[PDB]
């Protein structure tokens, strides 16, 4: 399973962010709002979660052979990931997620504060003009082979467009001592 693909727990669905390694052990990053739900996922067991404030979580794979170091493009192809980086305003990016598949746009703001009402406030989010819908959370924000973020939320949808926010992937990697595969 690769970045942007569906990960589930009972009746809930999110998207996998990036497959990563923690001291040689295969894990997957996803959104914190997702991992808060449960410890048991289709792909393994949750070993960390942080939401709100942040929006990241990590799941240890039950099957290490499944830790695919790519992002699925939803057209029968995949994008290889080799590093993690920081986003910059005006950067051309792509997002992969299980509801809407692959979409592109650009970064319009950094360090944005996002108020999700009853769900709380998240800080330091990447802001983009890429659309997303429920189910897309945790999915990959990338630019070529460089990993940038995990889908958190936004407004609108993919028919009318909207604004979306992403948790910077580097903060999630350093929180867990992980490296992208």
């Amino acid at each position: 399973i690769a970045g942007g693909e569906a990960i589930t727990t009972g009746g809930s669905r999110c998207s996998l962010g990036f497959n990563v390694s923690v001291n040689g052990v295969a894990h997957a990053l996803t959104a914190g709002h997702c991992t808060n739900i449960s410890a048991s996922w289709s792909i393994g067991t949750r070993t960390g979660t942080s939401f709100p404030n942040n929006d990241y979580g990590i799941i240890r794979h039950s099957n290490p052979a499944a830790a695919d170091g790519r992002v699925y493009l939803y057209n029968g192809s995949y994008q290889d990931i080799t590093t993690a980086g920081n986003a910059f305003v005006g950067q051309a990016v792509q997002r992969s997620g299980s509801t809407t598949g692959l979409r592109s746009g650009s970064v319009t703001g950094l360090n944005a504060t996002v108020n999700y009402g009853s769900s709380g406030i998240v800080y330091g989010m990447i802001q983009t003009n890429v659309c997303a819908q429920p189910g897309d959370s945790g999915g990959s924000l990338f630019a070529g082979s460089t990993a940038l973020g995990l889908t958190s939320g936004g407004s609108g949808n993919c028919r009318t467009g909207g604004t979306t926010f992403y948790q910077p992937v580097t903060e999630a990697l350093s929180a867990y001592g992980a490296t992208v595969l």
Binding site: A31, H33, D55, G97, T99, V114, N115, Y116, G117, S119, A132, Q133, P134, G135, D136, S137, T151, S152, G153, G154, S155, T163, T164, F165
Partner: peptide, 4 residues
């Protein structure tokens, strides 16, 4: 905005 809301969490996706």
């Amino acid at each position: 905005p809301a969490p996706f």
